[PDB]
A and B are shown apart, each in its own frame.
With several copies, the nearest count.
Chain A
Amino acid sequence: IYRKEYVPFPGHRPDQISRWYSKRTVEGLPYKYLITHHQEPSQRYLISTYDDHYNRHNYHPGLPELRTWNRHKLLWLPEKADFPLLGPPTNYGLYEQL
């Protein structure tokens, strides 16, 4: 019985790839697919409030200088603290110094 049952099996390589899928499905989704909301860059919101309100003097070359009243939202819409120049990151030269 032993020499009939326990016969060598040629060309039987093991499964070494489904365990990769099982490890990767428990690693989890990266941070892009779980917490990043409006497909947003890693360069946008890096502006200090001091650096926006004193260093650049509320620059933002796209707001009207006089606010205007709307018919639907009953407020004078263009809020200079609500659209705070999501633009050039705050640099002062520490990168080149280091």
Chain B
Amino acid sequence: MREIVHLQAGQCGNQIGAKFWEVISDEHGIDPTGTYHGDSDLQLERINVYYNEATGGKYVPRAVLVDLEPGTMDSVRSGPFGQIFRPDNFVFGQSGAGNNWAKGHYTEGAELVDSVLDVVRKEAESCDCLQGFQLTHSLGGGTGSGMGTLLISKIREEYPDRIMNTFSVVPSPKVSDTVVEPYNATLSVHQLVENTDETYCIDNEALYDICFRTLKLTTPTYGDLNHLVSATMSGVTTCLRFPGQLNADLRKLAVNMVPFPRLHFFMPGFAPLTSRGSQQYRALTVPELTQQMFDAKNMMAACDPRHGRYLTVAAVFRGRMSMKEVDEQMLNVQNKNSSYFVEWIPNNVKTAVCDIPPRGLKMSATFIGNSTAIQELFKRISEQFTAMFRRKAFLHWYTGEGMDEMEFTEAESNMNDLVSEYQQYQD
């Protein structure tokens, strides 16, 4: 009996999780007033994983919403499912961060984490058997990347046996949106390396490529990008909530996907994605799901896996299919281009099958990939870091709060050795 505590840091994490609860409340058939009015009684089998019970049978999510500004709280309380959230879970500061890891991590961020943990600890202690923690945040900012990492490095010692899950928005390759985002990204992922069992890297430029090429949506607002992130966000914790042929919770996807504890940076992917003008021309067969999830154009990370080697691969399927087609397809896509998988590990594909598809799809699939292509994402952040740091530019906004050169050198050294150990274990 397993339960997940979901954490939301900053503007990006607040919007992403406010969309996630929108996609979960209709999977479990929950009204905006909190009442359950779903289709089948299978939805109330494992509602405990994401929902508490209020008076009168209402269901409220087990989510903690944090920031240092009340503007995003005003945005998420004015959304569709704003009144289902717990009002005591809206913890906010009076002054913002504004793209500073130092003030979001040391002084203003640390002035709020006591009030955050006074709710998080109560929620975890009310749980009967809590299984893991979930965090939605962005590394390129100041309130998510600082206060979320401080929360990660404060709950890890309190609950050292649980599962840390992170939903990180890594900076995009082609176009940036903050000039100090290499600094915050490097510091955030330096904290992320040693206090997290698995991270799920998401890039917005790859999502633009998906929403323009695959879905033919030529005005991709942030709502559809949040759709895409949130769909694979719910497609990974599906065997907990619904029965199937082969089940897999977050710990089962941990053991088969992180061999060595510093190599736990993945890339996601959601299989059934077709444009409205290509709907009737696409057969709904399990081979087509396998083709679309295993192409490099359905990756939320801006990394081509042609260069690197897939160490281990996860694939969780929803809907009604035979195990023979899933097994045959995945064994044969391993066997055809066997030069893109490591030969030291004999078999690399993890299989899980759940019996309930999302509401409206015949069947679905979800890709998680450990590869030696994520270190390429870390290289360019390292080059931007050393380019910005060798001239000591944009640095006086950090050392005026408590930083020094030693943390920056330690973080750069950590990314250098992480790239080195990613390279050592490809060949």
- Whether the Cβ atoms of B360 and A28 lie closer than 8 Å is no
> Total interface residues on A, using CB and 8 Å?
34
CA distance A72 to B22 in the complex (A): 45
Q: Max chain A CB contacts within 10 Å: which of B42, B43, B226?
A: B42
Shortest C-beta distance, B62 to chain A (Å), equals: 19
| Structural contact, A36 and B361, CB atoms closer than 8 A | yes
Known: A48-B42, A50-B243. A29 touches B361 (CB 8 A): no
Contact segment of B113-121, B273-281, B344-352, B418-426: B273-281
A49-B276 Cα distance, complex, nearest whole Å = 30
Our pick among B57, B221, B279, B357 for the contact of A28 (Cβ within 8 Å) is B221
Cβ–Cβ < 8 Å partners of A35 in chain B: 227, 231, 272-273, 358, 360-361
**CB-contact partner of B320 in A31, A38, A49, under 8 A:** A49
Once the chains bind, are A46 and B227 in contact (CB under 8 Å)?
Answer: no
**Range of interface residues on B (Cβ < 8 Å):** 35 or more
Q: A98: which of B40, B44, B273 is its contact (CB, 8 Å)?
A: B44
Name the residue of chain B whose CB is nearest to the CB of A91. Answer: B41
Give the A-B pair count, Cβ closer than 8 A: 104
B320 to chain A, nearest CB (A): 5
- The winner among B43, B223, B243 for most chain A CB atoms within 10 A is B223
Known contacts: A28-B224, A31-B26, A45-B320. The answer to whether A37 contacts B41 by CB under 8 A is no
CB–CB B26/A46 < 8 A: no
Q: Mark A30-68, 1 if CB is under 8 A from B, else 0.
A: 011111111010110111111010000000000000000
Contact (Cβ within 8 A) B44 A36: no
Give the residues in chain A near B132, CB-CB below 8 Å.
none
**Do A31 and B360 touch across chains, with their CB atoms under 8 A apart?**
yes
Contacts of B361 in A (CB 8 A): 35-37, 40, 45
Q: Given A34-B215, A40-B360, A45-B357, does the pair A27, B223 have CB atoms closer than 8 Å?
A: yes
Secondary structure dominating the interface of B = loop
Q: Which B residues are CB-close (under 8 A) to A40? A: 359-362
The residue among A28, A92, A94, A98 with the most chain B CB atoms within 10 A of its own CB is A28
| A26 in contact (CB, < 8 A) | yes
The residue on A at minimum CB distance from B273 is A35
Tell me if B355 and A49 are in contact (CB < 8 A): yes
Known: A33-B276, A48-B243, A49-B320. A26 touches B223 (CB 8 A): yes
Set A31, A81, A82: member contacting B23, Cβ < 8 A: A31
A97: min CB distance to chain B, Å: 9
Q: In the complex, are the beta carbons of A25 and B219 less than 8 A apart?
A: yes
> CA separation between A82 and B286, bound complex, in Å?
12
**Could you show 20 A-B contacts with beta carbons less than 8 Å apart?**
A26-B223, A28-B221, A28-B222, A28-B223, A28-B227, A29-B217, A36-B359, A37-B274, A37-B360, A42-B29, A42-B360, A43-B39, A46-B40, A47-B355, A48-B243, A50-B243, A84-B320, A90-B40, A94-B44, A98-B57
Add 15 more A-B contacts to A25-B219, A26-B223, A45-B361 (CB < 8 A).
A26-B222, A27-B221, A29-B217, A29-B224, A31-B26, A36-B359, A37-B279, A37-B362, A42-B359, A42-B360, A45-B319, A49-B243, A89-B42, A93-B41, A95-B36
